[PDB]
């Protein structure tokens, strides 16, 4: 048989479904997420450059007419060595361009989750001074950090996304923090040309599998 040991997390595994909300200026819109594939960055190899998580993102009842917008998304998990908190120190590859942001934006968005200590903060460090080798490895830390980017839209055929929708625009990306103890997921949507700090909250729904 295939050995699945070490490739998945308890709350990050194929088939798992999250449900919750996205809050955008005092309005909450229901959200469904399905985790399709997980490839944790255990080591720095060729496959480590491929997306670490792939899944589906759904927004329901956006407008009285839309009622459903579904996208396929990729994403990368923050291991503190090869995929540090600051995107400026990510591997120099073209495929990582959609996940890039200025160091100030990365620092503030990672800090807002509130799970980091208040001391030893450095804007210029690759991990912002929040990681040392005496601290536990990323997989064993309580809080997992990810970046999610929606790469395809579809109604019946796939479309790449310079694209517009009524009430929606797929140009930014998601800072994501997963709690490994409770399974809850928090997130912030980011784009310089958008209003900052649009919130996302999620909890696993089909965990009893």
């Amino acid at each position: 048989p295939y050995i699945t040991v070490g490739r998945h997390l308890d709350f990050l595994r194929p088939g798992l479904r999250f449900g919750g909300s996205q809050s955008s200026k005092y309005t909450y819109y229901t959200v469904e997420v399905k985790i399709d594939t997980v490839n944790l960055p255990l080591y720095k190899d060729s496959r480590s450059l491929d997306p670490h998580v792939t899944g589906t993102f759904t927004i329901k009842n956006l407008t009285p007419v839309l009622d459903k917008v579904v996208t396929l998304f990729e994403g990368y998990v923050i291991n503190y060595n090869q995929f540090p908190l600051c995107s400026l120190h990510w591997p120099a590859e073209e495929t990582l361009d959609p996940y890039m942001a200025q160091r100030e934006s990365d620092c503030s968005h990672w800090k807002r989750f509130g799970h980091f200590g208040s001391d030893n903060w450095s804007l210029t460090e690759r991990n912002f001074g929040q990681y040392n080798h005496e601290s536990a490895e990323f997989m064993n830390q309580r809080y997992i950090y990810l970046k999610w980017k929606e790469r395809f839209l579809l109604d019946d055929e796939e479309q790449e996304n310079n694209h517009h929708l009524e009430g929606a625009s797929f140009e930014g990306f998601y800072y994501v923090c997963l709690d490994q103890l409770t399974g809850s997921v928090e997130g912030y949507y980011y784009h310089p040309a958008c209003e900052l700090f649009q919130k996302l909250e999620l909890v696993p729904t089909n965990c009893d599998a």
Side-chain angles (χ1 to χ4, degrees):
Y2 177 79
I3 290 147
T4 88
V5 180
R7 327 299 293 222
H8 310 331
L9 290 191
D10 273 353
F11 290 115
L12 202 67
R13 43 153 55 111
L16 182 79
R17 305 169 138 289
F18 294 87
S21 59
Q22 185 160 332
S23 86
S24 73
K25 269 294 188 258
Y26 287 64
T27 321
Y28 281 70
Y29 300 80
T30 88
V31 156
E32 302 170 21
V33 166
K34 209 198 169 132
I35 298 279
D36 283 1
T37 88
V38 176
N39 166 71
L40 286 194
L42 285 319
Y43 324 101
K44 170 158 127 263
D45 60 65
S46 36
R47 186 93 168 86
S48 148
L49 254 296
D50 287 314
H52 305 154
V53 48
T54 88
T56 317
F57 192 92
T58 326
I59 201 95
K60 258 163 168 141
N61 193 94
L62 245 186
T63 81
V65 47
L66 271 274
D67 268 317
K68 222 176 101 141
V69 198
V70 65
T71 51
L72 317 166
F73 80 91
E74 309 162 1
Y76 287 84
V77 164
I78 295 278
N79 74 61
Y80 299 85
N81 302 292
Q82 190 198 10
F83 288 84
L85 290 164
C86 183
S87 47
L88 286 187
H89 297 97
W90 277 26
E93 302 283 342
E94 216 275 351
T95 60
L96 303 186
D97 283 352
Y99 306 91
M100 310 288 322
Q102 317 180 348
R103 68 209 219 230
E104 290 81 29
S105 289
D106 274 346
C107 183
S108 97
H109 278 96
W110 290 136
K111 221 212 242 183
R112 227 181 157 82
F113 292 112
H115 314 307
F116 285 116
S118 281
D119 48 316
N120 202 349
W121 275 98
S122 189
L123 195 53
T124 36
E125 218 256 339
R126 64 193 318 253
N127 276 315
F128 304 123
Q130 297 305 124
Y131 191 74
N132 73 83
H133 283 298
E134 300 90 59
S135 54
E137 316 199 49
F138 73 101
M139 68 267 297
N140 306 325
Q141 224 145 313
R142 159 164 188 185
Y143 295 104
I144 292 317
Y145 296 102
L146 318 85
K147 283 190 176 176
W148 291 359
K149 176 72 170 177
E150 296 135 320
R151 275 279 83 185
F152 300 94
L153 184 71
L154 50 78
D155 168 65
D156 251 23
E157 298 168 349
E158 292 178 349
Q159 297 180 342
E160 202 269 298
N161 49 350
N162 260 309
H163 211 242
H164 326 78
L165 227 52
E166 290 292 349
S169 47
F170 330 124
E171 314 258 67
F173 72 88
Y174 277 101
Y175 294 87
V176 178
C177 172
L178 152 74
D179 193 350
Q180 288 217 87
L181 177 91
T182 85
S184 34
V185 166
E186 279 188 331
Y188 305 111
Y189 196 93
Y190 165 79
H191 197 4
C194 298
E195 174 212 48
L196 304 91
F197 307 72
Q198 200 154 94
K199 169 78 161 221
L200 170 96
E201 271 140 339
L202 287 183
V203 278
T205 72
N206 58 355
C207 212
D208 283 358

